[PDB]
């Protein structure tokens, strides 16, 4: 489903818990493609609460498998991601998505 | 002129020509055509008077007659050897009038050339009105059907050098010039006038299908550009496959700003948006990114 | 065929006729009543 | 490759700038879904760095600035500009504080007028409600459900405000140095798009009071508070394209001056009418204490009360404005204050009663004249904009007088509901421009539903007559109705919703029907419809306009009446093909289509329980000819009378085999003839006024009695009807439609002795 | 119903209406002359000068040429153009100032001086630049009775007043040069739609006036009785006034052209059409006499209506005279 490749520095113990906000600094990247979305250039943390089921399954799954401070290289499959028809006008059909996240989230 | 109230008959019989209106209900409720079959004594209201025509229309009518005769001879020639394999030799007796047709196409595109924008306003408007009138006079009697038939007959071949055999080896070089000049001549007709493109909007499928060959060069492309500029009512008819054909043209013939202007004109109607073609072109073009 | 059509065709190039008198010499003279002549549809090249 | 190689970029930048044309095109008027998609290809940081840079080729600089406008700022600017031509003023203490007097200097009417736009507006207008962009949110699993898709992509506006103030000053200062390498390769490329941005942000109205004061600074140091040196932008020589944008900026300032003027007028109005009404209370009370009854005192006391508020306010103010022939019922004290206010208003305008105007009004007049001296122009748009600006200044009374009809004040309490009304109206106006489709249909009904059932639409019909909302609803209706072909009925639900709203709008007040009467010729032209769809129709609203007026009925032209009966002629011939597709086999007539037209013809005549002679006369002359159809039964060529046709209809009613498998042909024929005699009986000549002597009544009554002679009504009314306790539907036979026959007998024939006995 | 104890917000809406009708709509403009003077006086700045005899248009000339360029565009129906109403009225009132702005018998010197300061005002306005501007848009207005024709005609009356032989030369030479057939067709279409004495509409309106019932204190919103019966007094008078002032001076060249165009394909012969309008008016007014013949005393409203019709009849008679005054 999700196969992260984490990076060492950070706490590495405080996992996310259900029904709480999760700050991120995600920067999208298409598989053998280009950047399409990012928040570092936009300068906004993009707060979101886990449990309400509003973000994509792969992103929350990758966030579940990590903890505070640690960077990671998230990977997502087309079925988990948009890849049945695709997000219209930006992502093509049958996509495979990549993300990498840093955070200073509260819990 | 103006006040004659004259009558006309044969020199031999002296039998006056007049309408009679013998028609049934069907023509009576429909068109007001009155077949002026002649009979004894005519009718009391057979008086006629004369109105002279200006210089331009008579000249234009004569050019129409000459071009129609030449292009009909051309069509007859092309149809003569269309369905006929032929070996090493001449195709038939009457060869085509290649040089005359080329000079005709050059002079006709020169004739319909628009006026210089640098010229003063009033005379420019007058020349514009004259050009619009001349386009209407040409299009009413025809000359889009002849040009369409000619280019369709020519485009059965694809090589432009080899497979165009039945015309003759002498016509190997002339084919590219003929098709390019014919496309430019069609562009010269369709420019400006609303009525011409309004009539020509039916052939959207024909023109967009024709955009699949180097001989079908950018002349027809800018014809489509003019059609979309001048006849916005056709914009609703457009479907997804036409957009795919246009994008295929952009990929196949390299980068070109003219196609970009074509798509931009295609996007928005006369002061009105169109969400359908907007979403279609946005889906097809952008997210691939290649 | 020939028909007495309405005013829509008045501006068009369909109703054009050429008055060709018989003899070549001085064809463009002042026409008179009862003069023999010929009618020529210039657009089609035909004769009534 | 950087956005920079100008030798190599000569071919490439042509293509790239034209691709930006495509980007702005697909971000068309009133689209946001595509705009959110385009934010990926061009993000915020790329855009902002394009704003700051000053090494671009120049066409790209214009393109990138314009792309910023196209994505984010287009939607809000268009909507707010549409609502900018309204001047609703809520009543508040903050409203009352506003005045023409400048704040911090006595006698400021002699001095300058303050500054334009610095003052608080407190005008009723809605917010924008942007939404931020993202591409990591789950799509809506359910259907569209007429959702808004997106509001618009968001940007931090404070950054843009502080930025846009900056390089304008830098560009003006660099121009003051008078260099020879303008940004983008030309001066006009430098100054056009930056001024385009700041011009749009003025329409946003998101500039501080100090910010607009600052922006007023570098135009020229002339419009300056009392409290190289960055010489004025206007003083510089600069080309025509930039001059057009300067006209746009000055037009915004003139609109702000006008809005401040009318706002202060409303502020004066509240205090003045309050003290005036208190004086009216005290004067009536003084009469009550010491009335001392006499004929003259009764004349004055009666004229105070019996006259309506219209003539009371009109007379009260008419007496005030006079050349000493006042005859004022009120004292001189209030009149002095009103004359001072009027003189202050006229002093604010150009009417006063070296080359240092020290005011906007004189400044721009000298400026446009100075532009007209040198550089004989060639842009037509610049000419129209310039002279439009010039005439507006000196005819301030004309501008004011043109603006006041659409001005309208309201309470403090009802401001919240007006947000629902105005934002729904903005949705309607925004959706007007787009070509029609299924999604916006469902969305459009939501706006119509909320505004129709708001609450505030019930009240204040003068405000509803303002804003052109009835014209707007008509404008959307004509588009779907337009096309000309019979198959131009695509999306046949907006017609029902529009007609329902218009029907309810006519009933609110009489003057609304007067406003709607002007389109009445057009509505009946399209009255030919399917004739049987549920809900309202164009013909129904056309009848609803003139239902209870008693003057609009007189105003009907003969051309209107002949059209509907010309349609009625075809009803007898045609067989109603919609019901042929339904399943009903074949009938020569069209009773269903005829009944609706006859209903509208009914509403012409019985206005307030009377019968207007003129319309009735034209109707009876026309009714002889075109209702010669409906077979030979009533034509007289046959002989099957009304009793014969009704008995035949009853035979079909009990026998469903003859008719096809809501609508029943027998009940339809019953209803059609009952409605027809309802019209014919109703349009008798008066009751007894003109019948006792005038000849027109006798002629009309004689022809009326001939067509439907006596000894046929008595048979039809005497016929039985199935009377169950088992029950039968009313959609087979009706007793009220039996009573429709009685209305003919009461007005036309009368009864002497024996008809009563029978 | 008492004015007091009303809503406080309602009285503001009442107050602005009465104040709009009380102080506003008062003749305090006093700026019509200043526009034409200011625009035309500054032909060039004191420092500004080409110094090669290449004179360029003035501000006013540019303003006129913009409208003339707009009129020449190919179109079916002309736009509303609310801007044009302003400058049309502003231009027309300038020459109106001499004749209208200014018992005792005036001196010969004062009267001749009053004839002067009008040809100069007319020459400031339209002898150069706007002679054919007015004539063009009449041809553009093919058959509409809208405000285009009204405002344009009012300017046309203002410039031609006194006879203005220069202006007649300019107008006639332009119209003869272009062969612009259609202008006289536009005049014919305008003339056919003129109002006459309709007795049926008058009787219906008399019943409406008799129905004096109030409606929310709004009885007089459409109880005018003048806008219903004629509706065209100003426009009809101005139209025939323009035809009078074209040939006020005994030209016998413009009159012949008006009778019958030579170079144009079709001739309208407006002088006969005026007789047709007069004949229609004769039948209408004659029928009105029969309606009031049995009645002894005439109503006040009836005499007022009949006086309005009589004034229009007078203007057509004078305009008819000027076609034949001078042999």
Swiss-Prot record, chain A:
Residues 19-107 form the PPIase FKBP-type domain. Inhibited by both FK506 and rapamycin. SUPFAM superfamilies: FKBP-like. InterPro entries: FKBP-type_PPIase, PPIase_dom_sf, PPIase_FKBP_dom. The gene is FKBP1B. Belongs to the FKBP-type PPIase family. FKBP1 subfamily. Identified in a complex composed of RYR2, FKBP1B, PKA catalytic subunit, PRKAR2A, AKAP6, and the protein phosphatases PP2A and PP1. Interacts directly with RYR2. Its main location: cytoplasm. Pfam families: FKBP_C (PF00254). Its EC number is 5.2.1.8. Detected in heart muscle (at protein level). Isoform 1 and isoform 2 are ubiquitous with highest levels in brain and thymus. Has the potential to contribute to the immunosuppressive and toxic effects of FK506 and rapamycin. PPIases accelerate the folding of proteins. It catalyzes the cis-trans isomerization of proline imidic peptide bonds in oligopeptides. It comes from the Eukaryota. It catalyses: [protein]-peptidylproline (omega=180) = [protein]-peptidylproline (omega=0). One of its GO terms (biological process) is negative regulation of release of sequestered calcium ion into cytosol. It is found in: Cytoplasm; Sarcoplasmic reticulum. This is Peptidyl-prolyl cis-trans isomerase FKBP1B. It comes from Homo sapiens (Human). GO terms for molecular function: calcium channel inhibitor activity; calcium channel regulator activity; FK506 binding; peptidyl-prolyl cis-trans isomerase activity; signaling receptor binding; transmembrane transporter binding. Keywords: Cytoplasm, Isomerase, Rotamase, Sarcoplasmic reticulum. GO terms for cellular component: calcium channel complex; cytoplasm; membrane; sarcoplasmic reticulum membrane; Z disc.
Curated annotation (Swiss-Prot), chain B:
Changing residue 2 to R: Decreases threshold for channel activation by K(+), caffeine and 4-chloro-m-cresol. Decreases inhibition by Mg(2+). Detected in skeletal muscle (at protein level). Fast- or slow-twitch skeletal muscle. Residues 1-54 form the MIR domain. The N-terminus is blocked. Channel activity is modulated by phosphorylation. It is found in: Sarcoplasmic reticulum membrane. The calcium release channel activity resides in the C-terminal region while the remaining part of the protein constitutes the 'foot' structure spanning the junctional gap between the sarcoplasmic reticulum (SR) and the T-tubule. Pore opening is mediated via the cytoplasmic calcium-binding domains that mediate a small rotation of the channel-forming transmembrane regions that then leads to channel opening. Binding of [3H]ryanodine indicates that the heterozygous channel is activated by Ca(2+) concentrations 4-fold lower than normal. Single-cell analysis of cotransfected cells shows a significantly increased resting cytoplasmic Ca(2+) level and a significantly reduced luminal Ca(2+) level. Belongs to the ryanodine receptor (TC 1.A.3.1) family. RYR1 subfamily. Homotetramer. Can also form heterotetramers with RYR2. Identified in a complex composed of RYR1, PDE4D, PKA, FKBP1A and protein phosphatase 1 (PP1). Repeated very high-level exercise decreases interaction with PDE4D and protein phosphatase 1 (PP1). Interacts with CALM; CALM with bound calcium inhibits the RYR1 channel activity. Interacts with S100A1. Interacts with FKBP1A; this stabilizes the closed conformation of the channel. Interacts with CACNA1S; interaction with CACNA1S is important for activation of the RYR1 channel. Interacts with CACNB1. This is Ryanodine receptor 1. The chain holds residues 341 to 630 of 5037 of the full protein.
Swiss-Prot record, chain C:
It is found in: Sarcoplasmic reticulum membrane. The N-terminus is blocked. It comes from the Eukaryota. Detected in skeletal muscle (at protein level). Fast- or slow-twitch skeletal muscle. Cytosolic calcium-activated calcium channel that mediates the release of Ca(2+) from the sarcoplasmic reticulum into the cytosol and thereby plays a key role in triggering muscle contraction following depolarization of T-tubules. Repeated very high-level exercise increases the open probability of the channel and leads to Ca(2+) leaking into the cytoplasm. Can also mediate the release of Ca(2+) from intracellular stores in neurons, and may thereby promote prolonged Ca(2+) signaling in the brain. Required for normal embryonic development of muscle fibers and skeletal muscle. Homotetramer. Can also form heterotetramers with RYR2. Identified in a complex composed of RYR1, PDE4D, PKA, FKBP1A and protein phosphatase 1 (PP1). Repeated very high-level exercise decreases interaction with PDE4D and protein phosphatase 1 (PP1). Interacts with CALM; CALM with bound calcium inhibits the RYR1 channel activity. Interacts with S100A1. Interacts with FKBP1A; this stabilizes the closed conformation of the channel. Interacts with CACNA1S; interaction with CACNA1S is important for activation of the RYR1 channel. Interacts with CACNB1. Binding of [3H]ryanodine indicates that the heterozygous channel is activated by Ca(2+) concentrations 4-fold lower than normal. Single-cell analysis of cotransfected cells shows a significantly increased resting cytoplasmic Ca(2+) level and a significantly reduced luminal Ca(2+) level. Belongs to the ryanodine receptor (TC 1.A.3.1) family. RYR1 subfamily. This is Ryanodine receptor 1.
């Amino acid at each position: 489903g999700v196969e992260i490749e984490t990076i060492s520095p950070g706490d590495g113990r405080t996992f996310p818990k259900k029904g709480q906000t999760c700050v991120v600094h995600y920067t999208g990247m298409l598989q053998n493609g280009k950047k399409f979305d990012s928040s570092r250039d936009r300068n906004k943390p993009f707060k979101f609460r886990i449990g309400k089921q509003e973000v994509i399954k792969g992103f929350e799954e990758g966030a579940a498998q990590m903890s505070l401070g640690q960077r990671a290289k998230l990977t997502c499959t087309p079925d988990v991601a948009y890849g049945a028809t695709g997000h219209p006008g930006v992502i093509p059909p049958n996509a495979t998505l990549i993300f990498d996240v840093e955070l200073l989230n509260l819990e | 002129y103006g006040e004659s109230l004259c009558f006309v008959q044969h020199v031999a019989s002296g039998l006056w020509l007049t309408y009679a209106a013998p028609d049934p209900k069907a023509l009576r409720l429909g068109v007001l055509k009155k077949k002026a079959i002649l009979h004894q004594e005519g009718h009391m209201d057979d008086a006629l008077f004369l109105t002279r025509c200006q210089q331009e229309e008579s000249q234009a009518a004569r050019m129409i007659h000459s071009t129609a005769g030449l292009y009909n001879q051309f069509i007859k020639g092309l149809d003569s050897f269309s369905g006929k394999p032929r070996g090493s030799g001449p195709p038939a007796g009457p060869a085509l009038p290649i040089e005359a047709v080329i000079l005709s196409l050059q002079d006709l595109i020169g004739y319909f050339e628009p006026p210089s924008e640098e010229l003063q306003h009033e005379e420019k408007q007058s020349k514009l009105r004259s050009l619009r009138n001349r386009q209407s006079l040409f299009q009413e009697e025809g000359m889009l059907s002849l040009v369409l038939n000619c280019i369709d007959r020519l485009n059965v071949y694809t090589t432009a050098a080899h497979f165009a055999e039945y015309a003759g080896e002498e016509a190997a070089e002339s084919w590219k010039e003929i098709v390019n000049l014919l496309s430019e001549l069609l562009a010269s007709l369709i420019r400006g006038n609303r009525a011409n493109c309004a009539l020509f909007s039916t052939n959207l499928d024909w023109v967009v299908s024709k955009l699949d060959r180097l001989e079908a060069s950018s002349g027809i492309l800018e014809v489509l550009y003019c059609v979309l500029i001048e006849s916005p009512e056709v914009l609703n008819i457009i479907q997804e496959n036409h957009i795919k054909s246009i994008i295929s043209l952009l990929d196949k013939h390299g980068r070109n700003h003219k196609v970009l202007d074509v798509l931009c004109s295609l996007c928005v109607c006369n002061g009105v948006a169109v969400r359908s073609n907007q979403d279609l072109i946005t889906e097809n073009l952008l997210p691939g990114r290649e | 065929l020939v028909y007495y059509e309405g005013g829509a065709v008045c501006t068009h190039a369909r109703s054009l006729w050429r008055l060709e008198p018989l003899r070549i010499s001085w064809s463009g003279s002042h026409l008179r009543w009862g003069q023999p002549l010929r009618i020529r549809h210039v657009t089609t090249g035909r004769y009534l | 490759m950087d956005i920079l190689e100008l030798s190599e970029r000569l071919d490439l930048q042509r293509f790239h700038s034209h691709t930006l044309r495509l980007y702005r095109a697909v971000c068309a008027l009133g689209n946001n879904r595509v705009a959110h998609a385009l934010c990926s290809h061009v993000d915020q940081a790329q855009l902002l760095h394009a704003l700051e840079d000053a090494h671009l080729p120049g066409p790209l600089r214009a393109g990138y600035y314009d792309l910023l406008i196209s994505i984010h700022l287009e939607s809000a600017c268009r909507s707010r500009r549409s609502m900018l031509s309204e001047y609703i003023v809520p009543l508040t203490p903050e409203t009352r504080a506003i005045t023409l007097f400048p704040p911090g200097r006595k006698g400021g009417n002699a001095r300058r007028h303050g500054l334009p736009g610095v003052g608080v507006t407190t005008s009723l207008r809605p917010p924008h409600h942007f939404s931020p962009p993202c591409f990591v949110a789950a799509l809506p699993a359910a259907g569209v459900a007429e959702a808004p898709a997106r509001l618009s992509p968001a940007i931090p506006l404070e950054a843009l405000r502080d930025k846009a103030l900056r390089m304008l000053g830098e560009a003006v200062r660099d121009g003051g140095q008078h260099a020879r390498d303008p940004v983008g390769g030309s001066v006009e490329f430098q100054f056009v798009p930056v001024l385009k941005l700041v011009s749009t942000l003025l329409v946003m109205g998101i500039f501080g009071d100090e910010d607009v004061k600052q922006i007023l600074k570098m135009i020229e140091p002339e419009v300056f508070t009392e409290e190289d040196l960055e010489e004025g932008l206007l003083q510089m020589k600069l080309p025509e394209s930039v001059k057009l944008q300067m006209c746009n900026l000055l037009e915004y300032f003139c609109d702000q001056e006008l809005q401040h003027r009318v706002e202060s007028l409303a502020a004066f109005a509240e205090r003045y009418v309050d003290k005036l009404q208190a004086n009216q209370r005290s004067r009536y009370a003084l009469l009550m204490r010491a009335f001392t009854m006499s004929a003259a005192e009764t004349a004055r006391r009666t004229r105070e009360f019996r006259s309506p508020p219209q003539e009371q306010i009109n007379m009260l103010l008419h007496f005030k404005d006079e050349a000493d022939e006042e005859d004022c019922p009120l004292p001189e004290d209030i009149r002095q204050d009103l004359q001072d206010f009027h003189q202050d208003l006229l002093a604010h305008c150009g009417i006063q009663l070296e080359k240092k105007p020290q005011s906007l009004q004189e400044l721009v007049s000298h400026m446009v004249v100075r532009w007209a001296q040198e550089d004989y122009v060639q842009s037509p748009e610049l000419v129209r904009a310039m002279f439009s600006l010039l005439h507006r200044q000196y005819d301030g009374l004309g501008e004011l007088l043109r603006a006041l009809p659409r001005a309208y004040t309201i309470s403090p309490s009802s401001v919240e509901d007006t947000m629902s009304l105005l934002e729904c109206l903005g949705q309607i106006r925004s959706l007007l421009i787009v070509q029609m489709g299924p999604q916006e249909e469902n969305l459009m009904i939501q706006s119509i539903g909320n505004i129709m059932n708001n609450k505030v639409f019930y009240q204040h019909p003068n405000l509803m007559r303002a804003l052109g909302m009835h014209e707007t609803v008509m404008e959307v209706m004509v588009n779907v109705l337009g096309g000309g072909e019979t198959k131009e009925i695509r999306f046949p639900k907006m017609v029902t919703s529009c007609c329902r709203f218009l029907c309810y709008f006519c009933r609110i007040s009489r003057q609304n029907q007067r406003s709607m009467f002007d389109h009445l010729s057009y509505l009946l032209e399209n009255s030919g419809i399917g004739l049987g769809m549920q809900g309202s129709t164009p013909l129904d609203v056309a009848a609803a306009s003139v239902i209870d007026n008693n003057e609009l009925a007189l105003a009907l032209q003969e051309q209107d009446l002949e059209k509907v009966v010309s349609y009625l002629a075809g009803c007898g011939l045609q067989s109603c093909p919609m019901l042929l597709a339904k399943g009903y086999p074949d009938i020569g007539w069209n009773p269903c289509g005829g009944e609706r037209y006859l209903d509208f013809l009914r509403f012409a005549v019985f206005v307030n329980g009377e019968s207007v002679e003129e319309n009735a006369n034209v109707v009876v002359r026309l009714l002889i000819r075109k209702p010669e159809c409906f077979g030979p039964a009533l034509r007289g060529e046959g002989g099957s009378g009304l009793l014969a046709a009704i008995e035949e209809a009853i035979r079909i009613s009990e026998d469903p085999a003859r008719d096809g498998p809501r609508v029943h042909l027998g009940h339809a024929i019953m209803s059609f003839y009952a409605a027809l005699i309802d019209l014919l009986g109703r349009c008798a000549p008066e009751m007894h006024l003109i019948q006792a002597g005038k000849g027109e009544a006798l002629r009309i009554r004689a022809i009326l009695r001939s067509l439907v002679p006596l000894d046929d009504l008595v048979g039809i009314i005497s016929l039985p009807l199935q009377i169950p306790t088992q029950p039968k539907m009313s959609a087979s036979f009706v007793p009220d439609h039996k009573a429709s026959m009685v209305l003919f007998l009461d007005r036309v024939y009368g009864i002497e002795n024996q008809d009563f006995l029978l | 119903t008492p004015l007091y104890n009303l809503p406080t917000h309602r009285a503001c809406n009442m107050f602005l209406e009465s104040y709009k009708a009380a102080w506003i709509l008062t003749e305090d403009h006093s700026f019509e002359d200043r526009m034409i003077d200011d625009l035309s006086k500054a032909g060039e700045q004191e420092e500004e000068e080409e110094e090669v005899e290449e004179k360029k248009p003035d501000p006013l000339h540019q303003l006129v040429l913009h409208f003339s360029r707009t009129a020449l565009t190919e179109k079916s129906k002309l736009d509303e153009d609310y801007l044009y109403m302003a400058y049309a009225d502003i231009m027309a009132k300038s020459c109106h100032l001499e004749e209208g702005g200014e018992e005792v018998e005036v001196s010969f010197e004062e009267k001749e001086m009053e004839k002067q300061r009008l040809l100069y005002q007319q020459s400031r306005l339209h002898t150069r630049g706007a002679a054919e501007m007015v004539l063009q848009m009449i041809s553009a207005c093919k058959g509409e009775t809208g405000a285009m024709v009204s405002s344009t005609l009012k300017l046309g009356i203002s410039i031609l007043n006194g006879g203005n032989a220069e202006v007649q030369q300019k107008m006639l030479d332009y119209l003869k040069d272009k062969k612009e057939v259609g202008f006289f067709q536009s005049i014919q279409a305008l003339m056919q739609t003129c109002s006459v004495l309709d007795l049926n509409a008058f009787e219906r309106q008399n019943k409406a006036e008799g129905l004096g019932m109030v409606n929310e204190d709004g009885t007089v919103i459409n109880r005018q009785n003048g806008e219903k019966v004629m509706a065209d007094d100003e426009f009809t008078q101005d139209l025939f006034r323009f035809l009078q002032l074209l040939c006020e001076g005994h030209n016998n060249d413009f009159q012949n052209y008006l009778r019958t165009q030579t170079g144009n394909t079709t001739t309208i012969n407006i002088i006969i059409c005026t007789v047709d309008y007069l004949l229609r008016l004769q039948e209408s007014i004659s029928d009105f006499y029969w309606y009031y013949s049995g009645k002894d005393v005439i109503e006040e409203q009836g005499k007022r209506n009949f006086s309005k019709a009589m004034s229009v009849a007078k203007q057509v008679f004078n305009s008819l005279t000027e076609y034949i005054q001078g042999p």
